[PDB]
Design a protein around this ligand. Structure first.
Ligand SMILES: Nc1ncnc2c1ncn2[C@@H]1O[C@H](COP(=O)(O)OP(=O)(O)NP(=O)(O)O)[C@@H](O)[C@H]1O
Ligand SMILES: CC(=O)N[C@@H]1[C@@H](O)[C@H](O)[C@@H](CO)O[C@@H]1O
Length: 355
C-alpha cells in the first residue's frame, strides 16, 4: 500500500507515539506485515488475508481468547493494540487490519544456528501444547477447514494438477510424481484421529522456528507468535511441522539442493525439548508416529507449495515466478533423507522416551 493509505490505517489504532514510518516487514507468506516506527514505541501492522481467513470475526475471537488467557497467567504473548474505539481489529475500505505491540529485545531464526536453539524451540512448543490443553475443542473454532487433513490437501493437489492452469506441469514431472507415489501415506494421522487411537488436542498448527521470538540476551523463548491457526488437531501436526522447517540444514527456499539435508542431530535436540515438556501426556501411538510426522507434514507442505505453483501462486507470497517450485524441491529432498534415516530417528525417539 501507499504511505498515505498506511498512515491512514494507523490512525485508526490506539498508538502511543507519532508515526514516522510504516514499512513492509518480515518473512511471512500469508498476511501482509509492516513495521510501524514512531517517536517512541514500535508496532506491527498487519492486513489480514481474507481469502485465506474469510471469517475475520471468528479468527480474532480465537486470537483474543488465547492471548487473554496467556495474559491472565502473566505470560508474554501477542498484545493486540485496540482501535481508538476499543475493537480488536478494523475493517477499513474493504480490508481487515490489526496491530500488535512490537515484541522488543528479541531475535528469531529461519535456520537453526546450533542445537541449543532448536532444543529451546522444542521446549517452547512443548510448553505451548500443555498450555493449549487447558482449552476444550469447542472454545476454538477452526479458522481454516481441513488444515492438516493431508488426504484433503492431496485432493486439492490432484485438482490443481489436472487443471494445469499455466502449463507449468510439464517442467515438474519428478516433483509431481513424488507426491502422487506417496498417496498411500497421507491418511495415517487423520485415520487415527477418526478412530480415537490418536487424541484430538488443541494445537498451534504452524510451528515453524521463526514463530518463536527468543530473548536477545538469555536465549530463552519469549513469545510464540503467528497464532492464527490455533484449533483442534494432533500433537503430531505441531511436532512434524517443527521438524520440517527446523531440522533442515537449509532455508525453505534454498535453490542449491546440495545444501539441503535432514539433520538427525537437530531432530534429537528438538525432541529432547518437546518430549521433555510433554512426557506426561504423550501416548504410545503418538510416540510411535513422531518420526513419520516429520515426513507427513513435510509432504503436506511440499504438496501445497507445488499445487500453488501449478495454480499460479495464489496462496503463498512469492518473490519470483519459480519460487514455489524451489520451495517444493527442498521439502522433497528433506523427505528423501527422512526416509533414509527412519531407523535412526525411531531410535532417537525410543532413547528419549526412556531417559
Ligand atoms: N508482535 C510482534 N513483534 C515483533 N515481530 C513480529 C510480531 N508479530 C510478527 N512479527 C514479525 O513479523 C513476521 C511475520 O509475522 P507472521 O504473523 O508470522 O506473518 P503471517 O504472514 O501472518 N504468517 P507466516 O507466513 O506463517 O509467517 C514474523 O516472522 C516476525 O518477524
Ligand atoms: C495459514 C497457513 O497456510 N500458514 C502456512 C503454513 O501452513 C505453512 O507450513 C508455512 C510454510 O512456510 O507457511 C504458512 O505459515
Amino acid at each position: 500500500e501507499s504511505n498515505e493509505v498506511l498512515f491512514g490505517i494507523a490512525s485508526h489504532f490506539a498508538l502511543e507515539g507519532a508515526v514516522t514510518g510504516i514499512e513492509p516487514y518480515g518473512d511471512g507468506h500469508i498476511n501482509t506485515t509492516y513495521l510501524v516506527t514512531t517517536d517512541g514505541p514500535r508496532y506491527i501492522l498487519q492486513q489480514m488475508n481474507t481469502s485465506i481467513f474469510p471469517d475475520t470475526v471468528n479468527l480474532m475471537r480465537n486470537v483474543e481468547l488465547v492471548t487473554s488467557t496467556l495474559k491472565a497467567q502473566g505470560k508474554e504473548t501477542l498484545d493486540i493494540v485496540p482501535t481508538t474505539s476499543g475493537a480488536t481489529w478494523a475493517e477499513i475500505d474493504g480490508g481487515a487490519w490489526r496491530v500488535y505491540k512490537f515484541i522488543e529485545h528479541t531475535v528469531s531464526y529461519n535456520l537453526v544456528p546450533n542445537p541449543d536453539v532448536f532444543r529451546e524451540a522444542g521446549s517452547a512448543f512443548g510448553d505451548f501444547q500443555n498450555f493449549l490443553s487447558e482449552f476444550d475443542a469447542s472454545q476454538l473454532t477452526e479458522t481454516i477447514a481441513h488444515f492438516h487433513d493431508t488426504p484433503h490437501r492431496f485432493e486439492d493437489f490432484k485438482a490443481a494438477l489436472a487443471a494445469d492452469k499455466l502449463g507449468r506441469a510439464a517442467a515438474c514431472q519428478p516433483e509431481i510424481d513424488f507426491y502422487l507415489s506417496h498417496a498411500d501415506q497421507y491418511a495415517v494421522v487423520m485415520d487415527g484421529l477418526r478412530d480415537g487411537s490418536i487424541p484430538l488436542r488443541v494445537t498451534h498448527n504452524d510451528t515453524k522456528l521463526n514463530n518463536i521470538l527468543m530473548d536477545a540476551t538469555t536465549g530463552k523463548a519469549r513469545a510464540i507468535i503467528d497464532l492464527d491457526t490455533i484449533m483442534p488437531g494432533s500433537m503430531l501436526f505441531d511436532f512434524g511441522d517443527s521438524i520440517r522447517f527446523g531440522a533442515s540444514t537449509a532455508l525453505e527456499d534454498e535453490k542449491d539442493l546440495s545444501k539441503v539435508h535432514f539433520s538427525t542431530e537437530l531432530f534429537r535436540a528438538y525432541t529432547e525439548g518437546f518430549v521433555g515438556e510433554l512426557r506426561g501426556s504423550i501416548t504410545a501411538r503418538e510416540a510411535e508416529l513422531l518420526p513419520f510426522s516429520g515426513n507427513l507434514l513435510t509432504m503436506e507442505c511440499g504438496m501445497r507449495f507445488l499445487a500453488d505453483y501449478l495454480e499460479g501462486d495464489i496462496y503463498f507470497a512469492t518473490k519470483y515466478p519459480e519460487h514455489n517450485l524451489v520451495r517444493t524441491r527442498t521439502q522433497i529432498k528433506l523427505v528423501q533423507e527422512m526416509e533414509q534415516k527412519a531407523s535412526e530417528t525411531r531410535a532417537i525417539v525410543a532413547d528419549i522416551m526412556e531417559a
